[model samples]
Target chain A: GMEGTEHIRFQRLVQVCNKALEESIRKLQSWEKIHECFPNYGQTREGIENLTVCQQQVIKLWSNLSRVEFDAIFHERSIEEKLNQLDDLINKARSIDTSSSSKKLRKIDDLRPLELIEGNLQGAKESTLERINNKLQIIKESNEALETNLKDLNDNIFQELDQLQQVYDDMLPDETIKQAVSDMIIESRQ
Target chain B: ATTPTMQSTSLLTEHLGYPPISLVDDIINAVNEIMYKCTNAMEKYLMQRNIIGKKDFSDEIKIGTAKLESLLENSVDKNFDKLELYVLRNILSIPSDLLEENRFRLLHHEKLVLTDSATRAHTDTSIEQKLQEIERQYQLNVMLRDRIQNTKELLTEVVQFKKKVIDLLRCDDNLTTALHELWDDLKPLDVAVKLITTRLKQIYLENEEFYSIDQVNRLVKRYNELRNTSIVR
Candidate 1:
């Protein structure tokens, strides 16, 4: 500007000599004026609402954090209940797998290998003798086997008694000798 | 006179999805830096003119008051003088003079050749440095916005991992119901088992194997002693 010949031609942007310097000095007389004038003055009519928007951002973040906290509060009891149910289920499952009754059941099932049977049992009931009725097949088999084996020895002795009575009635020399010695079996031992 | 002025504006984050709070803090810092420099420069200008502070004016002067005084002193008076002289030469007289046009050619040519005296106002180099500082500060604020955006993204990961906590909770719930129902059904063979000797005792007792019965009967007498711990039937 002071007798400048060429540099002025290069001057293009008006902001190169901005006037906020003048206006800023006029507005910023004291600290109190900064609150009222500066932030309001700093707004962009379009791009940024500036201080208003800045604070809006903070509120948005605050609300986001508060939502997480509220959800935590709401889900607290349900979370506790779910965990507890997990524990209960785990305990019962372990018992079923390794309990004394389970141990006995395993032993009986294991006998399938020794017995050489490939057949399956056809299979329940309600409160009507459920404890014994559940075991009805096994109970019947046990009783029958016990009684049937007892019949083997009883029949062995009874046949001998019946033959003795026949011996007394026969009076034949040769027949008595054979019958008394060996002809007394009515059923086999097996 | 058309005064050149910077637009009164601030940085924005609207186009960028969420507004970054940290960005605004630094943005305001840059804005404050420029305002501080502008005010400090004015007082410096005023002090240089001896208009305030050091040899304070009896009538107090702030930044604007001092700037007006300096403007009047440096440019207003000189510009007014030039304006009056230019007006006097061109006003109220008819232009028929060609009399002394050749008499003072050297002097006259020099006077009229560089007639324009309205100098363009420019910021001082000192104030210019302050502006550059503000520009540097503003640049840093923009850079910090990148950092701020990344910081919020990191928090987003934390947010999802927190959501995983809820999923893990459901995983436990699922296992609870699934395993419970699975193991309870069928009342499988594992539920009724123990040792083979117990079965042998039952076999010996079942048949007419009474010769070994005394020994086996006592051994198997306690086999089903845990009836109290039996299943729910």
Candidate 2:
């Protein structure tokens, strides 16, 4: 039942969620703007709050997805590992500045879905379900493309960081070994 | 500078079911006449209450524009006969004029306009410098002209194709709606093909003569492929 078009509904949901998450990152990064936009943080909170709501909905929607379809799209091991990494990130997120708290909250909101990805099976409307499956497939493909680009950028950054690290390593002291040899020589003299 | 355009194959293509070559041509000829008559009449459209020129009738103009805009926007597809075809022609023509105006000034050929220092180092001239340069430059002109011509041809073809689709759309409302939705889904691919073709045209025109009649044939074939795929979908 892994019909391509059937998977489209799920893809749409993921696209919506991804869009919300991207905006959330932007808002949390700009806390003042977030505050300026939302005087009371009701529906006015378009960024972080919207992301959180979308993340929750995505989690709820994930359950509605067929196992065959979900497994085909999302890597079970990688997703689980990422979810754990995200949980750790959530814990560390609190330690970052309060201005960044909104971003952390948004990310946590996105991550919280990992816990609720498994929805109740035996849902009706098999036709609609298949459409959701196709959509999710598209979402997974889009995410993979984005992930590759992000990783490429990260690889370039890491290469630069490694060059900097080489400079730092050369400046660090190796005097401890010399001191140990001197101490041994002093002991023999004594 | 205008040349008589060859009779379009569309007249025959439209009548694939039967031979309507004469009929189609006659109908299109009549349509063109009516369109030109209206355009001529617009210059003289006056009322007793108002000696308002076409420029002065802003309100009437807006009403006229709104009527056409509403027709296209409200409908599933844009009607060809209803549209001002010359407007589309003018849109494509402007770029052609621009390409012609800047053709030589763009430094397409005729060396790099080297500085005094560069001239000193590379003083050696070719055996046929002037003749070779002229030939190279002539080729450049042809290539640039070809590019503008091809782009104009493409836009013209697109407008014509769009009109054909609109004709198809007008035939049935449900079919139009379905086709519109399908077209929307495949719109990105259509745009991608257009972008790729334009890019190839630019590169080949500037750099290589590798793109010739064969290239245009490939593009036409690909366009037909895209159109067929869109219809099937």
Candidate 3:
């Protein structure tokens, strides 16, 4: 968080927080003396407890940075798994959703597109297959869409995409698309 | 007290979002400029002070420290003061001492800030590795979010059972088994929340730490406050 202060201020905060933490530790060691000097648990105890908490908080917060580090690692692993899963899932989803497998049979069915009253066997079979395929696409796309949504957040890795796609959906129309796309700087090309 | 600009600067993923290059580059430029300026000023000050010493001296006294015995024969300022104290106060103040000590600290903190940046910039990890990491976290976040979406998902859960277990007059074998399984998920959720809270606090602190970098600090004084109050998850 110490990104932009005058060097003096930057140094001062480090000194101050460290000093505070140090003193808090020293005070803990001299706890007996504190009670001896102040002799009032009611007031002094509260302040001492607060100071201890502050020290712990700072120490813990500093170490807690492992979370970011861990998240960095976590993102690394997750993306690996997701990318693999995505490849499999999307491929499977595409294949299943298309009914291309049944297309050969459908061509030979000799069924009319709009003909045959009420639930003709050939049309019924195609309609059911189509629904199933559409559902699979939705399911597959949802996974991809979610991965996309999450890509925004991972280790702040949102930078490395096409600027325009970063801001708006690629499917959108007009300058709004431009606005969104342009908003994302071309961090790099895949 | 100037706050660091809440500007984005990740070149690695600028295409992934509306990357804020203007801000990041600004910080890098600011640091460079400040380092240059401070160095120049200090150098100039040192040179001018040295020149002042020459002018301040008379020919005899200018010779050497040991020659001071003869110079003192002139008998002006009588008592010779201990030399170090004079130099220390004039040349080396507590600010410098504290500054140096804290600079070490600030540098350490900066390391954490740039760690991710470095990792992002590094090609050693490979694009595939980076993408994998991204995908993994995405799934976890999504899963957690989905799970959190409904408390009803807790009905078969342990935290669910904990609250309801005592009130139960009779429980079925299958229902009890389900409740135990729910408890398992509940424990991790609780732990995850704690872990996330701690991480959030660190990120906030690290963000606060950047205000001291140089440019934003030169312009304003609210970096810490900005992170504390304005930042959103």
Candidate 4:
């Protein structure tokens, strides 16, 4: 039965993964259910990030995922880290025909993967795969903790905050306050 | 002069003529003494010949006589008495095998040896076996060079493949708009999945793009304006 058509196998995989995604989203959203004063960005950037992770797993279960799907899942990471480094390298190459920038381009080429020196191609490829897979494995563990966190919160999710004011105030924040609070959270969160 | 070692051998021969096993220690010491002295004597004589030709047959006879003197000078009496006594005790304690008449007696004769040819045949394969092994090693050394050459080409293509993949992994694949359109066209887990996606998309776009570092207010206003343009099919 599991060895059915591609669509049928994908159908089961999609449901289970989507279910995890949905459950995790609900777990994220339901943060306000218990707390009297929930912190800002807990469900906005942070919750979206959590859902993004769940989405990545779902899509991984989806090319083996297509790049479009994979990139969207890692929009922040794929763009901010790797693509930005690549862009710096591109800008280095995009000289104004000046000697100063020509030297800049030289440095950029050195940083590249297939330079046949220092950053050797084999080591570079392995470095990329290692970084990606390291994060993937790290996320695997975080996901376990997430699932476990959801369970713990699930058990005591509705302990308090039956009041409407407590529920309403949870999502409100001035952007500056959130930036400070979120930065502080991120500092300790990792 | 009569040396004592030959005496020990004669003693063992005479006593062991009746099958004496207790004389093994003296025999071993005698064997060691003979080997050491016999070898050193030849080396000394060779040295004397190399130094200067003093005499011929007289020298040869004197050298042989000196070899005997060397054998008489020093003997290697082993600290083998303790081990020999233990062996004697164990041998005496062990039960005898042939205690009857028609038991085989010790016999020896100096003659040509042929039975050892069978024992020598066991390691006969070693003479040819090492040839194949060494030959295989030389080819494998050459094979190692070709292995590295093949890997370099494989790696160049692999390096090219990395850039293509990195570019592929950078697409802005936002399916939320299409899903939203689907939501608008039709009235929707499937719907819940869409709702969650919409919520996430709204959060993602709002936080990530709209309200990011370089304020996208004009872009947000433009987005809202374009967003209202989607009326029907």
| Predicted structure with the largest TM-score when compared to the true one | 1
Question: Which ten-residue region of model 1 chain B has the weakest summed lDDT?
Answer: B3-12
Give the per-residue Cα lDDT of candidate 2 at B215: 65
Model 3 misplaced regions, further than 4 Å: A1-190, B1-24, B55-233
Q: Give the alpha carbon lDDT tens digit for every residue of A1-190 in model 4.
A: 2122213322332343334333423422343421212233223454345434633443343223222342343342222332233223223334312332122222112233433232233334334444655655564565556456554544443333233235334322246446644644543311
All candidates' chain B TM-scores are: 0.22, 0.20, 0.16, 0.24
Give me the runs in candidate 4 sitting further than 4 Å from their true place. A1-190, B1-114, B164-233
- Candidate 1 docking class: incorrect
Report the number of clashing residue pairs per model.
Answer: 11, 14, 48, 2
What is every candidate's C-alpha DockQ against the true complex, given to 2 decimals?
0.01, 0.00, 0.01, 0.00
| Runs of candidate 2 exceeding 4 Å displacement | A1-126, A170-190, B1-233
Compute the DockQ of candidate 2: 0.00
Taking the tens digit of each residue's C-alpha lDDT, what string does model 1 give over B119-213? 11121333344456556555655655565565556556545654454344223343343335454344433323323444644553455333344
lDDT of 4 at B207: 51
Q: State the C-alpha lDDT per candidate.
A: 0.34, 0.36, 0.35, 0.37
| Candidate 1 stretches greater than 4 Å from native | A1-60, A77-129, A136-138, A164-190, B1-233
CA-based DockQ, model 3 = 0.01
lDDT of 1 at B61: 28
Query: Of the pair 2 and 3, which is ahead by lDDT?
Result: 2
Residues A22-92, model 1: lDDT tens digits: 23333223334324333333232421233345334433443344335434432532323322332333233
TM-score order, best first, reads 1, 4, 2, 3
